[PDB]
Design a protein around this ligand. Structure first.
Ligand code: DGT
Ligand code: DGT
Ligand code: DGT
Ligand code: DGT
Ligand code: MG
Ligand code: MG
Ligand code: MG
Ligand code: MG
Lengths: 480, 480, 480, 480
């Protein structure tokens, strides 16, 4: 009442007792045991940080922004009840994360449970509900002036969007700007991003191109289309674009690091192999698989990065195959990266097609002499979609600006007004190919398959293609 | 033996005694009295740093890179003599800078001496010669194993390019890579840039996305077209593009800051007004103007940021007009910024046309009722060319890469291979308009003139145009 | 060739392949799963870093120092074989650490196994041997020019001192300075400290008073008493004292943080409760307790922070008591801190007396009316010894200096020469008292017991004593 | 409304328009032309920062603390008028500084004008009055709710203490805590210190021992002796001591750097030589010396670091001696540092003492064979007093603390309660000796004079004494 926590990114963070009550629960504390960057820690030893510290940061920044708007614009009638709700959403948006974070909902669940559609945000809402009910938080909310029925809705809406005009039941259109702060559905500019840019750079040893503190200073609320929305100062438009650039740097350099991804792939492989044999106790003593733990929050509370070690230390013969894979990670005996390429023209690769791609690479017949012949099962093909968070769309088209001369009047800024250099399209795809067989002979073969395949599909020439496949590259005139 | 200097960017820098001898001279120490960012200090109070500290940083980094290549590749046969020559060029490349740095050669000299063609690099070569001769350095160079005739040529060549087939007399083609380090004519990737990105961000409070230390680690020398050149690792290509992005961020945010530029303009105005009256004593007691001090290095040694204060504290009635302008800077009564716009389509603006542009803006007739009428003299129009340092050209097309699989074999990477998102053209122009009359009524008028002019010229719509000129904007269809 | 690892403290670290081979093993990778600061992470959310990253840092710095001495002093005849051996010791010095680091050897093992005398360094030597033998490293050592018999001895000796005139068989007296780098028995000034000062501050959000990079620049090897030792430049003496100040600041603020220590205590409690029931498989399928895992390295490889979760998620009724304690940690239902005090005059507290101390506090009869009566079992008393690493001794008396005027002649600098302000003794004791019963009534009682006990024992007055025990404090004249 | 300034230490600083009006004046802007660390810049190239940026930082922090207290304790009845007054005092505390900062009032004025007693704080008060009157600020103060008569008094009192039972007319005793923030007379803990610790380390490349942000969080106002005073939390006592430690590190390492001080001395020498010949115009066209410029604020406004260059570029024969000294600085031909020593026992050196000391060193007869004989005029002796800002006194004895258990009740914490290690006395004296004759023969002689003198006076043995005076050191038994 009220507690101070020291954060290496933000310094000294003040937390309201209600917030601290939420934090001090198994459901929140679970976050301590999940790595923010998953397998990236294996590539970047600095990235040891967990979801928990990030969540504090997100909660803190959400507080900063909402308070700043209140001081600048008292007419907005922001209340402490409003501030706490926004901060709670900030703290709890990452609650739903599974072991190794994005690996879990990004790779494992889709392969393990194709029938189901699941996301960590869906998990965060379920976990939040479980957190409140199991630990008697509603009385505490009431004690500090929150109205649980309205406010819990409001918190969940911030995390996951409308639960099903104005589509939100948590707050009226008058308070629309509040929905922008923690997870920005409209344009993706939100405090969650700011904390992780700063936190990940700090731990990775990389550097950030976006200043979040500056953005808060120049933020204003203006009426847009009978909605009150956060508006950025016109000057700051370049800085917004920088934010997205920074995001893409990080994703290319770290989140989508080629080796880091392969490790995530291998961990997923082990999980699939262990999935039937692992048993996690849920509410009522019911037993769940790693894949089905998402169905019961009590089970899910106990599901964390720890599973990795549980599998690794297991003596059970049923788990032997899963155990071997993790062991290969420890020895650094990884699947081998062959190459990266890009689709040409307007072509994009559909999700359905992903399964067929390894077969496609094996099918290519390079015009070369090969000692050994690879198989579709031997290859791994990873497709990565890089974008400004709106897929093809430009997020800044969806941002609102104001000018120094008339702060109250919102305006729109087109891409042409900022720069002619900026891209026509804001999304592109990367294709990475790996070979499961690591022998020198197998690797040489894989390169030939890969470069031929790139040529066959009219994909962009690999950068090292001249060196890895000198015989294959001359055949394609376009490559020269 | 070695002196150690502590640098906030680089930590502890070791300097060879020969280097220290060069540093401890009037000509080098002059750099202490010239602000790195000129008028930017008035916008950014952190940017108090001077050319001197930057030069040390450049010298140090040059040493780092050349040493690294020597340790990695002893076959290159790099010698200490080579190392010292590269470092001396690094230290002395900024020697030529005038008061307020780029303002002096960027703005003042062109207006004061249109007939002459001058650059600070020209000045650095002249100043270096003067430094060596006045302080008896050549014996010291010999004492440490340098051959002055060959080496002084080599140093000057690094600073300013060939002094007029291999075009350099300082070193043979086998040593070509050395010419890449301090000033890179071919692609602009050099240590001078790296130090200032780091140093300027540190002092400004901004942050950058280029890691120079990483670049050194991955640098290699490979044969390219019967030349030995520094080559980047293929992976690092994204980081190279990031370096240029970072450079553009800095330029937009700081080097070309709208208010900082206006102050530079005002300072230049004062210099022009004072130019006839100020006298600087040169060799033999000859007297020079601020504008002609570049002709005599002895005069130029004494020409620094100090001139600004000399004018400001002057009691001479002849200097009164110049003095007033500087006084207005102190009071913060500055010329007022009206707007920024961009040319469209094919159109580009030639240097010769610059004089014409203020008259053009006055000539526009808005079609809105105006209390007051402005004149060409009233306006200032500043044209800024933003590029990747190669004008229209893409610098990465002029970079050489190597691959992990064959470190010795250099390769070329096209833009398509890196990204589809990257720009088709790498240069653009910004037009900024300022009004000399600062009253509210004049400022309103200037905006109308400006927006109408943009419409007339088919320039891009100003971002705040709707707010500043609501009546003018509807007329242009293209702006809707 | 060399692998590069990016470290947020050190930037880009180059690792020799022999080093990488050692790193990529279960035994080394185990370090990924042990928190550097143990329970401190629960107090400091930034301190998520593990032993693994710290070990890389130690290895890197060891390399730096040895290389620097080689470059500065070729006459020392340092070899690559020497460099690799020093680096291997640096990397493997932390190999022996148990779950939660110092908690394990600091608290758990002494309570669980009073008969045995054990330290993590002893463990590191055993683990290193196990690592080499299990993974066939000796051939690899031979391949890179190491002599395993001589060099393995050398490595172990650096870690743990002489394995039992010159007492070391790993290297002769001419190479004595090498033994100073990784673990300094004489002074405690070593690279292991430097990395953790920088790494812990970075993660904790604290700041560091010692510059290790500067120290390396000014380090020299000189003959001292017929031994070659690393010597500091005379100027740097103040910085050395600062290093120790920094160490103390960290220890009081973070390593010995009152809440962090209590968490470590609780975790230890849980371990003791679980010890009989947990079974860890060792070599030959033998089964070990948490306490006995140190006897078998195969068992020990699998013993990590993971145990904490294993206990927490356990359904076994035998583990219920242990499980509850960890659950209380999650809810933040911790033992409560009562006060800190210091012994006065001659007095110091012997290790044997520690068992007695809780009873002593319960025995005190404060002159205040108490509704509830506490028992010896209710109290926890923690005795912490704070010193400059030499107990009562001043470490700088055991440092050798050289002067700019004669860099080869070692000299000695007394405390009086540096400062009159420096402490007469370099060691002191802190006593912290906690209450296991957390109710408000119990806590009030515990404070009265504690302050009375301080008065009885003639200990220093608690800082908050006037407020927590207003009735007790007037009785002691010395306090009033 | 608010202007935003970007500060590398503090990030984005909001400034009230009233504050901006004050800032945008010749009197404030003058601070841009005075180096914070004076001659230190010549030793540390990073330390290019000026008083101006520091002042903004002080103003900003003052605002932070006063706002924080208001939010935490509304009962205090702090008003915007109060906040602005405190900020104005923060901004203007450094207004009085002369060229090269402490050199000017520390060295030059005492030598030039021994009759007068002057400090920069006196200057700041005079300058502030001049700033307000010349630029018509009072109406602006009135416009924003200040009462000039009361508030100007309040501002001056904060800067310089009582202008002549409650001694202040600017605010009543209930508002006593406000006087603590900008300049703390009673204990020296104030925002001015916090900004410079952070700013100087950042520029220097050194690092901080004190967290100011944390201190603000834990600051509270409590009644002490019928006064309301800022009180620190009991826990933070160690950190307070650390703040003073940090201050001493900086002073020994940088502010009192031996070479930096000598440069300051040389600059002072030049000033004294130039003093009669330089003329600075004052109000009404009156002419002043450098030494008498402090008498007229109009003259003083134009007196800055620029003077150094004015002397250096002067052609006047009268200035030739002054000019030569500055030229010697450029060439790095400095007076040579001989040694440092300390007085022993109770002995202390009085200010009157200083003039005699060079003669005393010349008088010593080492009786070692000497080629040359030095004279009193040849030596320079610099006496430096290092303390916790209270001379002999412990500042923490003059701090007030509160406890978590009773936040409203202030308490006192004695040195014995924090640590037994802390010193009994908090002040010590350093004596540095320099020789004006730089030749090798002269330098050897000076060392002998110096070490003999240390022996004669029973001063502490110099650290390098054994090496510099091997014959002299054996004579003193106490040293051996
Ligand atoms: N930077 C810094 N952080 C600290 C220091 N001491 C503690 N911390 C960190 C640890 C926590 O994340 C945060 C708050 O810790 P505290 O020690 O102030 O809280 P604690 O609950 O132990 O004390 P309290 O309950 O108020 O008596 O600050 C310090 O001296 N410096
Ligand atoms: N600071 C920084 N670190 C990076 C970047 N990319 C990777 N790293 C880190 C991750 C690793 O700790 C270390 C080396 O990563 P690399 O991708 O350069 O090595 P990798 O083995 O993946 O590639 P290679 O075997 O050289 O093809 O540097 C980057 O752009 N910036
Ligand atoms: N978990 C935990 N860690 C501690 C404690 N005391 C110190 N540490 C941490 C601080 C450093 O990050 C690390 C240093 O341990 P090492 O075995 O590497 O060095 P050593 O034990 O010699 O510590 P020292 O040299 O005295 O700092 O241990 C403690 O009570 N608990
Ligand atoms: N970190 C950072 N600082 C900036 C940037 N642009 C400007 N600054 C600094 C320079 C100043 O100290 C401060 C404010 O400069 P601005 O350009 O934001 O204000 P200005 O008065 O020029 O614009 P205004 O009159 O409000 O339209 O922030 C930026 O993009 N990043
Ligand atoms: Mg020196
Ligand atoms: Mg690799
Ligand atoms: Mg402005
Ligand atoms: Mg002070």
């Amino acid at each position: 009442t009220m507690k101070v926590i020291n954060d290496p990114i933000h310094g000294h963070i003040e937390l309201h007792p209600l917030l601290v009550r939420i934090i001090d629960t198994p459901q929140f504390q679970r976050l301590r045991y999940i790595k923010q960057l998953g397998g990236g820690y294996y590539v970047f030893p600095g990235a040891s940080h967990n979801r928990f510290e990030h969540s504090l940061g997100v909660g803190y920044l959400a507080g900063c922004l909402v308070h700043a708007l209140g001081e600048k614009q008292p007419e907005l009638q922001i209340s402490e009840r409003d501030v706490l709700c926004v901060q709670i959403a900030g703290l709890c948006r990452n609650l739903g994360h599974g072991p190794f974070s994005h690996m879990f909902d990004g790779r494992f669940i889709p392969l393990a449970r194709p029938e189901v559609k699941w996301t960590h945000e869906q998990g965060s809402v379920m976990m939040f509900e479980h957190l409140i009910n199991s630990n008697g938080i509603k009385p505490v909310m009431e004690q500090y002036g929150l109205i649980p029925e309205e406010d819990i809705c409001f918190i969940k809406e911030q995390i996951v969007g409308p639960l099903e005009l104005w589509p939100y039941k948590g707050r009226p259109e008058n308070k629309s700007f509040l929905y922008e702060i923690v997870s920005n559905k409209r344009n993706g500019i939100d405090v969650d991003k700011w904390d992780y840019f700063a936190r990940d750079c700090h731990h990775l040893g990389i550097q950030n191109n976006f200043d979040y503190k500056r953005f808060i200073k120049f933020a204003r609320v203006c009426e847009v289309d009978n909605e009150l929305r956060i508006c950025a100062r016109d000057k700051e438009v370049g800085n917004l674009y920088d934010m997205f650039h920074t995001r893409n740097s990080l994703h290319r350099r770290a989140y989508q690091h080629k080796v880091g991804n392969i490790i995530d792939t291998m961990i997923t492989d082990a999980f699939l192999k262990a999935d039937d044999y692992i048993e996690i106790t849920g509410a009522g003593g019911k037993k769940y698989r790693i894949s089905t733990a998402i169905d019961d929050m009590e089970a899910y509370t106990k599901l964390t990065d720890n599973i990795f070690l549980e599998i690794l230390y297991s003596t059970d013969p049923k788990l032997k195959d899963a155990r071997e894979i993790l062991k290969q990670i420890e020895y650094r005996n990884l699947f081998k990266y062959v190459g990266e390429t890009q689709p040409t023209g307007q072509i994009k690769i559909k999700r359905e097609d992903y399964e067929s791609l390894p077969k496609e690479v094996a099918s290519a017949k390079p015009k070369v002499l090969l000692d050994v012949k690879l198989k579709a099962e031997d290859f791994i093909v990873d497709v990565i979609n890089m974008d400004y968070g709106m897929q093809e769309k430009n997020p800044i088209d969806h941002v609102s600006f104001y000018c120094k001369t008339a702060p109250n009047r919102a305006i729109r800024i087109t891409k042409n007004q900022v720069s002619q250099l900026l891209p026509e399209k804001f999304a592109e795809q990367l294709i990475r190919v790996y070979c499961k067989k690591v022998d020198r002979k197998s690797l040489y073969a894989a390169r030939q398959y890969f470069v031929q395949w790139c040529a066959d599909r009219n994909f962009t020439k690999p950068q090292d293609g001249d060196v890895i496949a000198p015989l294959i590259v001359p055949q394609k005139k376009e490559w020269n």
